[PDB]
Amino acid sequence: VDLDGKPIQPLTICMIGAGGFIGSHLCEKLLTETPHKVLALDVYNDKIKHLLEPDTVEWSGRIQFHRINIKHDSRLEGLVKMADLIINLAAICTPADYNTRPLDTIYSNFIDALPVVKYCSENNKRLIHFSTCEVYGKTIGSFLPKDHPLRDDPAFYVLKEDISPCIFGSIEKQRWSYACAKQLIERLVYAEGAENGLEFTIVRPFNWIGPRMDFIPGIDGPSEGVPRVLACFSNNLLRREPLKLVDGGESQRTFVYINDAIEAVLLMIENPERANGHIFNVGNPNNEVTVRQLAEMMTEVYAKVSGEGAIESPTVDVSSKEFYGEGYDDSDKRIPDMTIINRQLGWNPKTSLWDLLESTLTYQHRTYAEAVKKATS
Amino acid sequence: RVDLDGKPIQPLTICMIGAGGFIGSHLCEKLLTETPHKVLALDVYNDKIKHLLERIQFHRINIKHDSRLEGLVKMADLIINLAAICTPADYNTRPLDTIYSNFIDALPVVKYCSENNKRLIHFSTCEVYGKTIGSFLPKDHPLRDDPAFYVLKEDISPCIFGSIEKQRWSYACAKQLIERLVYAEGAENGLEFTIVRPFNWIGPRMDFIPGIDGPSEGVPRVLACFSNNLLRREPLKLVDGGESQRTFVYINDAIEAVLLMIENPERANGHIFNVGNPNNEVTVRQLAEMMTEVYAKVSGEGAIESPTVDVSSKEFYGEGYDDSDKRIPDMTIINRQLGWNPKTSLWDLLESTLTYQHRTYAEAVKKATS
Numbered sequence: 001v002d003l004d005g006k007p008i009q010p011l012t013i014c015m016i017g018a019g020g021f022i023g024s025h026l027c028e029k030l031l032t033e034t035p036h037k038v039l040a041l042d043v044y045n046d047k048i049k050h051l052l053e054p055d056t057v058e059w060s061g062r063i064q065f066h067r068i069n070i071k072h073d074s075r076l077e078g079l080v081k082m083a084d085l086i087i088n089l090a091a092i093c094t095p096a097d098y099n100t101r102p103l104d105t106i107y108s109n110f111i112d113a114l115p116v117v118k119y120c121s122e123n124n125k126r127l128i129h130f131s132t133c134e135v136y137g138k139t140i141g142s143f144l145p146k147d148h149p150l151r152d153d154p155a156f157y158v159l160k161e162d163i164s165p166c167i168f169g170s171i172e173k174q175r176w177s178y179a180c181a182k183q184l185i186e187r188l189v190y191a192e193g194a195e196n197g198l199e200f201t202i203v204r205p206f207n208w209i210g211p212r213m214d215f216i217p218g219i220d221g222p223s224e225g226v227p228r229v230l231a232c233f234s235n236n237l238l239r240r241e242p243l244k245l246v247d248g249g250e251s252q253r254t255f256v257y258i259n260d261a262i263e264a265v266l267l268m269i270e271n272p273e274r275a276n277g278h279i280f281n282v283g284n285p286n287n288e289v290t291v292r293q294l295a296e297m298m299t300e301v302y303a304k305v306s307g308e309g310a311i312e313s314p315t316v317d318v319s320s321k322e323f324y325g326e327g328y329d330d331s332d333k334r335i336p337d338m339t340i341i342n343r344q345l346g347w348n349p350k351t352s353l354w355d356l357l358e359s360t361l362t363y364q365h366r367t368y369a370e371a372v373k374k375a376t377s
Numbered sequence: 378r379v380d381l382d383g384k385p386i387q388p389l390t391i392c393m394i395g396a397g398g399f400i401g402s403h404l405c406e407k408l409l410t411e412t413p414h415k416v417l418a419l420d421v422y423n424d425k426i427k428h429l430l431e432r433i434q435f436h437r438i439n440i441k442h443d444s445r446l447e448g449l450v451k452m453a454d455l456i457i458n459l460a461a462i463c464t465p466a467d468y469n470t471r472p473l474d475t476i477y478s479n480f481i482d483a484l485p486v487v488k489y490c491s492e493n494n495k496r497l498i499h500f501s502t503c504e505v506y507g508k509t510i511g512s513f514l515p516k517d518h519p520l521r522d523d524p525a526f527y528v529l530k531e532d533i534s535p536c537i538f539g540s541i542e543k544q545r546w547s548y549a550c551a552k553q554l555i556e557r558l559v560y561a562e563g564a565e566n567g568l569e570f571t572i573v574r575p576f577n578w579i580g581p582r583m584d585f586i587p588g589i590d591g592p593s594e595g596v597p598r599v600l601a602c603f604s605n606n607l608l609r610r611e612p613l614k615l616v617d618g619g620e621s622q623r624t625f626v627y628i629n630d631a632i633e634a635v636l637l638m639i640e641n642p643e644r645a646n647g648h649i650f651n652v653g654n655p656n657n658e659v660t661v662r663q664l665a666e667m668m669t670e671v672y673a674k675v676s677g678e679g680a681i682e683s684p685t686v687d688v689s690s691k692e693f694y695g696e697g698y699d700d701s702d703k704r705i706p707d708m709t710i711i712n713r714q715l716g717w718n719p720k721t722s723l724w725d726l727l728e729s730t731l732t733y734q735h736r737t738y739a740e741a742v743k744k745a746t747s
């Protein structure tokens with residue numbers, strides 16, 4: 001039974017990018033805590049392999065992998081026509097290659113999604129599209145003088161979905177490739193909801209953290225690769241290397257536990273009358289830190305989880321020219337406004353930053369530690 | 378005879394897309410009368426260039442779906458893409474068509490220019506900057522007087538748009554993405570390009586007068602809207618009291634800019650350029666007053682009892698309207714690469730433009746009046 005009070009309709013769900021970080025955890029909750037059927041579309045199924053026929057016949061009947069690449073595949077429209085609800089996670093979303101592969105980024109996050117939107121509207125399906133907190137980009141407050149008191153007024157940093165602005169860098173700041181593409185797909189989805197009647201929901205994750213996020217380089221991902229900060233610092237800790245802090249890690253972020261976030265998504269799935277229409281910030285405003293702090297906190301927790309104590313200097317600064325490359329820029333302080341998601345679905349993140357890091361770093365140590373010891377010799 | 382870098386001007390075949398538009402039409406007049414270049418005029422409609430079909434070649438083509446485009450591109454040395462829905466009126470009313478127009482439909486053009494090693498001049502907009510960071514500081518806060526917060530420099534000022542529900546930014550966001558893509562294509566592969574950001578170009582064949590040149594219920598850009606208001610002696614509708622600001626440049630001044638870009642690829646390839654006239658700033662109220670004054674001069678007849686009136690943007694534009702508040706173009710970059718500056722005054726350009734408007738539309742609107 002749902003939030004409205006009505007009983008829960010069971011449904012076939014087409015999940016695109018379902019073998020990803022978010023996808024994989026989403027399948028865990030749908031399978032274990034709901035009646036719904038999942039159609040898992042992705043190019044790779046590595047992260048959901050524990051849930052499939054090869055590994056177990058415990059769920060089969062309610063999940064079905066389909067190796068598909070949505071750039072060119074006729075089978076997609078049928079697969080959509082198969083389900084009642086489409087969830088589109090499929091997207092290049094590591095900042096590393098917003099400024100290095102800008103074309104592939106734009107094509108991934110805007111162009112390749114268009115068909116998905118076409119089919120949902122044509123065949124009268126419901127769509128949940130995953131955008132990003134990067135759509136807000138920078139805070140208004142960031143342009144006031146250093147230590148100007150207006151910075152303290154939440155007016156200038158809290159990111160409300162119905163009224164805060166989308167602020168990006170100039171064009172030459174190619175990192176915004178990603179954000180601009182996400183912005184346009186949102187305007188299009190919203191437009192399609194307006195010009196025709198598309199039932200939709202848009203999700204703006206603020207830095208979701210957990211097991212299975214991205215990859216450790218030189219183990220289950222390219223040696224030359226560069227993931228998102230969780231994975232980057234995870235790698236740094238496992239190899240007993242200091243944590244590289246980009247331009248002194250003074251930007252701020254708010255991390256939410258992956259499990260907390262998935263609860264949110266589920267509520268959206270099961271309450272379409274309160275989610276259709278809306279755009280939703282999913283983040284945990286209470287777990288704010290600078291990147292320096294994330295680093296310190298992670299080394300502390302790691303030392304707890306690992307046994308071993310910390311390094312002489314456990315971090316070090318590095319320029320974004322050195323780290324990210326040429327056209328890097330950065331959001332400075334993401335603080336998600338909760339009013340809309342809180343009013344519509346009653347959601348709140350239960351989990352602490354420290355708690356979530358303990359959890360996540362234990363998974364990381366359990367998984368990667370022997371492997372990284374064997375790849376040092 | 379000669380470019381800025383001193384070299385001679387080799388003649389060129391120019392593929393002009395959206396060539397029968399406002400800007401296109403004036404661009405053709407200039408290329409024809411003042412340069413050796415050959416023009417291929419692609420548009421669906423040729424009304425505004427029909428006077429020039431007595432070195433130019435119309436091709437009734439719709440770039441959404443048309444195979445002959447790639448050959449037409451492969452024909453020329455330089456492509457200029459003006460083709461774009463660009464009246465604010467239907468950013469919030471036809472958002473899908475806007476996005477498809479300003480982003481999706483342009484992609485092929487970009488494909489062909491990069492594949493076949495042609496040079497591209499893409500027309501974006503000052504709307505890409507959107508709102509001024511100054512606009513978010515408190516009413517009458519002094520930091521608003523610091524140019525730091527309103528001058529729009531192309532290499533560093535930010536793109537600030539409204540939230541998603543403010544559907545007017547459909548247009549701006551699409552233009553933003555096409556710019557990032559063009560620039561990306563210039564980076565990931567070697568595309569020779571230039572991007573143009575017009576700040577409110579004003580002149581003769583801009584848009585249409587409703588009930589004469591176009592639909593009666595239609596809604597163009599402010600020049601045409603007020604032109605109609607004056608011609609019919611109605612008051613000028615001021616949207617939420619017309620307190621937003623703009624900077625108008627004379628169409629003739631602007632075309633000179635474009636020409637320099639055409640003939641100096643050495644200085645224009647790579648760059649993005651503000652083309653506007655920072656000296657001709659006014660609020661919309663002021664544009665209205667100034668236009669009624671000039672009109673009275675040009676027409677003979679004097680003004681009316683109340684020559685303007687306020688109207689809400691709910692009433693005027695519809696549901697998801699929002700607005701840029703203060704466009705002031707920077708110009709360091711254009712001024713230092715092409716040496717361009719707008720000669721022409723606002724008053725002067727309005728005198729000129731309103732005389733053209735009166736000459737053209739006044740007997741036609743007297744006929745249709747009765």
Ligand SMILES: NC(=O)c1ccc[n+]([C@@H]2O[C@H](COP(=O)([O-])OP(=O)(O)OC[C@H]3O[C@@H](n4cnc5c(N)ncnc54)[C@H](O)[C@@H]3O)[C@@H](O)[C@H]2O)c1
Pocket residue numbers: 016017018019020021022023041042043044068069070071088089090091092093108112130131132133134204205206207208209214
């Ligand atoms: N994790 C976060 O903190 C975070 C933050 C902001 C936004 N997001 C957004 O959430 C969504 C999911 O991100 P994630 O964390 O699961 O990343 P992820 O990369 O783990 O998930 C994306 C999955 O989509 C798949 N995919 C990409 N292109 C594809 C194609 N053509 N065909 C089939 N599959 C394809 C990938 O193979 C991958 O498994 C993205 O849209 C992202 O923009 C995530």
Ligand SMILES: NC(=O)c1ccc[n+]([C@@H]2O[C@H](COP(=O)([O-])OP(=O)(O)OC[C@H]3O[C@@H](n4cnc5c(N)ncnc54)[C@H](O)[C@@H]3O)[C@@H](O)[C@H]2O)c1
Pocket residue numbers: 394395396397398399400401419420421422438439440441458459460461462463482500501502503504574575576577578579584
């Ligand atoms: N007029 C201004 O002051 C101003 C301000 C900012 C930006 N711009 C930009 O400059 C460019 C031109 O502006 P304009 O005032 O000439 O607009 P316009 O509408 O007068 O000209 C655009 C032309 O492109 C044509 N076109 C549209 N779709 C087409 C298609 N599928 N195939 C062929 N032709 C098509 C139109 O029919 C029209 O003739 C646009 O890209 C606009 O965004 C202009």
Ligand SMILES: O=c1ccn([C@@H]2O[C@H](COP(=O)(O)OP(=O)(O)O)[C@@H](O)[C@H]2O)c(=O)[nH]1
Pocket residue numbers: 095096134207227228229230232233244245246247249251253291330331
């Ligand atoms: O090894 C790293 C990885 C990331 N960052 C920074 O930490 C923040 C989080 O970046 P991430 O790549 O996780 O994505 P973002 O939040 O920028 O979308 C950003 O300010 C990055 O510049 C860092 O200093 N070192």
Ligand SMILES: O=c1ccn([C@@H]2O[C@H](COP(=O)(O)OP(=O)(O)O)[C@@H](O)[C@H]2O)c(=O)[nH]1
Pocket residue numbers: 464465466504577597598599600602603614615616617619621623661700
């Ligand atoms: O009849 C009109 C037409 C336009 N405007 C306003 O004048 C400005 C210019 O709008 P336009 O459509 O010319 O182009 P924009 O600068 O909005 O791209 C905007 O503030 C409009 O809201 C107005 O008050 N009355």
